[PDB]
Amino acid sequence: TLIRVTPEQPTHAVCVLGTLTQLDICSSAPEDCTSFSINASPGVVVDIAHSSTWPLDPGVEVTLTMKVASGSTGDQKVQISYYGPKTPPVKALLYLTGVEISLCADITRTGKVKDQRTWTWGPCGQGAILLVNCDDSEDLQDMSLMTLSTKTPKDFFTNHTLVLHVARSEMDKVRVFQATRKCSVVLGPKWPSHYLMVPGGKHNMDFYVEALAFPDTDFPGLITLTISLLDTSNLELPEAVVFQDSVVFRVAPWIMTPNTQPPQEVYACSENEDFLKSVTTLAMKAKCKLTICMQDEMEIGYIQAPHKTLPVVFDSPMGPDFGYVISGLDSFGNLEVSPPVTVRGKEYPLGRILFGDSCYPSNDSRQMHQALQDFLSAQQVQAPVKLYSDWLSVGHVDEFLSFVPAPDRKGFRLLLASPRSCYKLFQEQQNEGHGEALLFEGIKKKKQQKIKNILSNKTLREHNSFVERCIDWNRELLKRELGLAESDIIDIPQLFKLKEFSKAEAFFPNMVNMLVLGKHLGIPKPFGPVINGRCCLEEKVCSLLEPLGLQCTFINDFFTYHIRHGEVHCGTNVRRKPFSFKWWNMVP
Amino acid sequence: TLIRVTPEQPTHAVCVLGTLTQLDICSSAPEDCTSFSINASPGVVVDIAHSSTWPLDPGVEVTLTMKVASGSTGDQKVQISYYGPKTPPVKALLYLTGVEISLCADITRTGKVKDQRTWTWGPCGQGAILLVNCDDSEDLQDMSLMTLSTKTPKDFFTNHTLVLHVARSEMDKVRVFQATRKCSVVLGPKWPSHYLMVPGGKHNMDFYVEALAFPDTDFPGLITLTISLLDTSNLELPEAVVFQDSVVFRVAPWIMTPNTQPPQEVYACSENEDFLKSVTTLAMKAKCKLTICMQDEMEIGYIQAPHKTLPVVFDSPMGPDFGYVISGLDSFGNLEVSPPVTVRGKEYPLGRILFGDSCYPSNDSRQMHQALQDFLSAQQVQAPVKLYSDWLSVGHVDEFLSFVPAPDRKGFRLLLASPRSCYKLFQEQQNEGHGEALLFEGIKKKKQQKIKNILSNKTLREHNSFVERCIDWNRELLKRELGLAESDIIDIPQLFKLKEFSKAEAFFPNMVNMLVLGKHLGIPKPFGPVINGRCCLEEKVCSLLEPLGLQCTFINDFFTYHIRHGEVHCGTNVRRKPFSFKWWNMVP
Ligand SMILES: Cc1c(-c2cc3ccccc3n2Cc2ccc(F)cc2)nc2cc(C(=O)N3CCC[C@@H](N)C3)ccn12
Ligand SMILES: Cc1c(-c2cc3ccccc3n2Cc2ccc(F)cc2)nc2cc(C(=O)N3CCC[C@@H](N)C3)ccn12
C-alpha cells in the first residue's frame, strides 16, 4: 500500500476509499532533475507533507486520497513532473482505480450498523457484540448483522477477489452465514476462509454471525473477522494481498440476576402439598407469573446484546424456559450474586457472584471445581468473590446468606444467619417466664424441645458459638469485597447442629434461604416456640424486615428429602428482570 | 475479625498487629442503659467513629489497634461501661492477646525484603518477582526470599497454629523450601498446604521460592502464597481461621534481545572453513567472546528479577550456555524482536517480537503453531507482531528483515530486502557499459550470469516484481506496529527466484540476514558482478551502512546445506546484553 512510480513505464494501482496511500516519488527518479511537482485528476487528493513546486528530498511524504470510487479501471490519473536547472520536465504517470470495500457490524452498540480493530469497554468504546447460539428471518433475530458494502468498476473482480476469514484459533467459536434475498455457512469450524462471489458496481452483502462458545479459560471472548482484497492479474504467480479490513466481535458473557432484581416468572415444577397454594398466593400478591410441570440444580441468568436480551439457564453438573449451557460445592446452591455495589471506587453495577470454598486446601477440604471458578471469572462483569462454606455439611453460601430489597442506604440488605440473634431472643424469653415454650410444636415426626433445655445445653451453645465464628469470617469477607457497613447487614436468628465430621446443618428450617419476589418474602416457617400465640422467631424476622416494607409470609414444607442423590432441596426458582445497565458499558 | 463483648462473661480475643478490629459493643448490651464509654490498657488504641462518653447507637463504630505484641496471653484489657439515666455502670471485659504475623518478600523490587494483595506493573507498582527454575547457598541465589516474622507469647502456639498454602490451581507452578540454618520442600505440586512448626516469642523463618512454569495460555503468571492463623483451643470442634495474609508473586517472562543490544558472546559451534577466521577477526574487532565445539534452531533470551538476571535459551521444536526451556514457521529462524520502539503513544521498551505467518489461512497456507504464538503473547512485555512470510519457501522473517544500530533518529535502521534497489543498480551499470559483468565469478559449482542477461529476463523481472509487493506489504505492517517513517528504513539490494509452488528463495546469498556485533557487521558475501574490481553489490551495502558508522565485512560460506532435515542454515548465534530497563516497570 505504498505506490512506486517510474518515469520508465506508467504504473497502475487500486485504492480503497479511506486509506492513506504513500507515493515513492524518489526511488526511480532522474538525478539530472533536482525538484518535482504533482498534478492529478479532480477526484484524487494529493497531500505533500515536508499550482506548487517541491524538492526531490527523499524526506518529503506525498500521500494519495480518492474521493468517489471509479466507474472505470484507471479513470483517475496522477502525473509526476521531475524538472531541474536546465533539464526539461520528465513525466511519470500513475493510473489509479478507486474502490469502496467497507465491512461493518454494530460497533457503536445501538442496534444499527455503522476507532480501530480493537474492542473497548464502556460508554464510549467500540465493538460489536455476538450472542452464543444456545441450541431464518426469526433465527437471524438472535444473530448479529455484518454487511460488506462495495462500489467498484463493472470490470473490477475480473482480476481482484475478496475472501472473508477467521483465525484457525477462533473458527470453532464462531459461525457466519451469507444471506441471499435464505442463508448458507461461509465461515465456522473446519472453514476459516471463504472466497466471496461479488459483482462490480454498488453491491452490499448481508452476513449473519452467531458465537458457539461462551468466554472461558481458553477463550478471552473476541472473534475477529477479516476481509482481504487479492490481486489475481499475474495469472502464473500467486494472489497478492492489496487490502485488509476487519471487525472485532466480543461474545456476550453469561450474567446472573440478584434477588434485588424484580421477578418475572416463578418455577415451582416441584410432589407438593398446600405449599403450591401459599406460593400462588404470594405469586398473585407479587403480580408475578407461576408455572408447574430440580430448581436447586440450575440458575436462570441472561446473555445481552443491543439487538437481543435472551434468558439463558446454566445447569449445574427437560421442558422449562429457552436457552441452556463432582463435589458438593459444584452445585448452584453454592452460587449467589450480590446486588449492584461500589467498593473503594471500583464499581460493580451487575453485582459480584459469590461462591462457597474452603479457607485453605487440606485433604479434608472441598472446593468448587476450578473449571467453574475460571468460567465465572471469564465473564468478567460480576468479578466472583470466594466465601467460606466448607464448614457446612452441604457446603452452599445460600445456607447462611441472602439479599432483600431495601428502600434507603444502598437499596438492599445482606441477610446473614446468626446463632447469637436467636440465643439473645430464646433467653430474653426465659427471663419473662416462657422458658417452658416448646420448639417443634405441631410436627408429625420430631422430638420437641423447650427454650430452657436448649439454653441449658452446653454442647449446643459451643457448636453454635463455633458457627458464629465461621459466618463472622464471611461477614468481614462480604464487608470488604462488597464494600458494606454494619448498617447494611441484618442478622436473622438461626441455630445449627454439627452432624458427621463436625459439619453444620440448620437446627430449624433455614429462614435466611427465602423466596424474594420484590417486597414479598416467602420465608421458610421455622416452626419455633410459640409465645402468646406467635412463633417468637416469626416475630423477630418480621420486626427486622417489615420496617423495610417487606411482606413476610412463613411457608410450611419449604424443603424436601428425595430418593436418589438423597439430599434436602428447595423446589422453587425465579427468572428475574435483566439489569438496565449494559454489561458492555462497565470496565473490568 | 469482629469481637463481640457480653457483660455476661469476659471475652478473650487474639489481635494481629496492623489489623483494624471492630467491636460489637451493642448486640449483647443492656437496654436499661442508654450510653457507654471505653477504657483500655495503655498498649491498646480504641478509635470511636460516629476521658469520653458515647451513645449506644448501633451506628457508632469502635475499632481496636494494638501497638506492641503481647508477652503474655491477655496482658492487654478493654473495659466497656454501659451507664444510663439512673442505672449504675455495668462492665463488659475484653482480654486481648496481640501478636505480629508478617509474611514478606521483595514486593518493592529492590533485592531487599519489605499496597494490597494485587500485583501492579510499573515504576510505583508492588509485587515480588519469581524466576523459573530452568534445570544450597548457591542454588538459593536464583530463588526468591520470603520470610515469616512473628512476635507472640511463649505460650501462643499451644492453641494457635500457622499454615502456608497455595491454590491447588497454582501448586504445580511453584516450589517453596523452608531454610534451617539447609532446606526442605513445604509447598509445591502434590502439596498445596503446610502446617509450620513455629515457636513463641520473636521467631523469623526464611523460605526460598522458585517458579516451575513460564506464563502461557493456561497461566497468567501469578502465584499467591497465603499464611493462615488457626485457633485450635476448642479441641472437639474443627480449626477456626482468625487471620490470613498473602504475597502475590509474578513469574518473570522470557525476553529476547534485538540486534541493537550489545553482543556478549558469539557461538560458532558450527564442519567449517576460513569462515571461522573471518568470524574470530570480526569477534576480536568487536571486542566480543567467541566459542566453538544448530544456531538457527534456538534463541538465547533472558529472565530477570531484582536479585538475578540469567540467560535462558529457548530451543525450537547439548553443551552451550546455562538455562533451557511441526511446521517450517515453528523455527526461530521465524522469530526476531524489534529494538525499543514507541507507537502512537504506547511504549515498547524491550521492543516487539516479530514472527512470520500467512495473510489468511487457506489449505495451501502455513502458520506458526498456535501453541508458540500464545506463549510469546503470555510474556506480554514484547507484544508479538504478525508479519507475512508464507510467500517464501523456507518461510522465515529473518530472510527479508533485520535491524542494525544507528547513531541518529530512533538509534536503529530496519533493513528490508529489496529487488528494486538491486535492479536500479544492475541497470545503472549497463548504462555505463559493464552490462557484460558476470554475477557468480569465482564459484566452484554455479552457472555464471551477466547483468544484461539478468536484466533482459522478463520471467525474472516479474518474479522479483511480485516479491517486491510481498515485502512492501510487511514494509507497511512494520511501519504501523513499530511506528516507523521511511527515514528509519534502508533497502538492501537483494533479488529472488521462485522455486516449487511459486515460493521464494534469495537469488544470491541473502545479505540482509547478517551478523550484527554492535557497529561491526558480518554480511554474507553476495559473490556479485565485479566492476572496476569491487562487487557492485558490496559497494551499495557499504554506501548505505558505512555512513551510519557500521564496519561491513563480507564473509564467504555464510550458509550451508546438511544431510538429515536437509536445509540451508546459518552457523552463528549471539548472546546479547539484557535491557537496562526492567520488564516489570512497563505497562501492557
Ligand atoms: C437441615 C435443614 C433445615 C431443617 C432443619 C429441620 C429440623 C426439623 C424439621 C425440619 C428441618 N429443616 C427443614 C427440612 C425439611 C424437610 C427435610 F426433609 C429436611 C429439612 N433447613 C435447611 C435448609 C438448608 C438450605 O438452606 N439448603 C438446603 C440444602 C441445599 C442448599 N442449597 C440450601 C439446608 C439444610 N436445612
Ligand atoms: C537460497 C539462499 C541463499 C543463497 C542463494 C545462492 C545462490 C548461489 C550460491 C549460494 C547461494 N546462497 C547461499 C547458499 C550457500 C550455500 C548453500 F548450500 C545454499 C545457499 N542465501 C540464503 C539465505 C537464506 C536465509 O536468510 N536463511 C536461510 C534459511 C533459514 C532462514 N532462517 C535464514 C535463505 C535462503 N538463501
Numbering used by the authors:
A (entry chain A), B (entry chain A): 5 to 54, 65 to 128, 135 to 155, 173 to 218, 224 to 312, 315 to 337, 348 to 371, 385 to 392, ...
What does the paper say about this structure?
Here, we present a non-covalent PAD4 inhibitor JBI-589 with high PAD4 isoform selectivity and delineated its binding mode at 2.88 Å resolution by X-ray crystallography. Crystal structure of PAD4 bound with JBI-589 at 2.88 Å in calcium-free form, reveals binding mode same as reversible PAD4 inhibitor GSK199 in partial calcium-bound form (4 calcium ions per monomer) and overlays within 0.53 Å RMS (root mean square) deviation. Primary amine of piperidine moiety preserves salt bridge against Asp-350, Asp-473 and interacts with His-471. The binding mode of JBI-589 was found to be nearly perpendicular (~ 70°) to BAA orientation such that 3 of the catalytic residues (Asp-350, His-471, Asp-473) positioned almost in-close proximity for both binding modes whereas 4th catalytic residue, Cys-645 is located ~ 7.5 Å away from JBI-589 in a direction perpendicular to the plane formed by BAA and JBI-589 binding modes but proximal to BAA. Upon JBI-589 binding to PAD4, conformational change and movement is seen for the region aa630–aa647 from helix to ß-hairpin/loop. JBI-589 is very selective for PAD4 and this can be corroborated with structure as the central part of the inhibitor is closely packed within 4 Å by Phe-634 which is not conserved in PAD 1–3, 6. JBI-589 was screened against recombinant human PAD4 enzyme in ammonia release assay at 10 semi-log concentrations where it showed dose-dependent inhibition of PAD4 enzymatic activity with a half-maximum inhibitory concentration (IC50) of 0.122 µM. Treatment of human neutrophils and PBMCs with JBI-589 for 24 h at various concentrations resulted in minimal or no changes in the viability of neutrophils and PBMCs up to 10 µM concentration. From thermal shift assay, binding of JBI-589 to PAD4 was assessed where, in the presence of JBI-589 melting temperature (Tm) of PAD4 increased by 7 °C when compared to apo-PAD4. First, we developed a highly PAD4-selective non-covalent inhibitor that is orally available. In conclusion, we identified a novel, orally available PAD4-selective inhibitor JBI-589, which prevented the formation of NETs and PAD4 dependent citrullination.
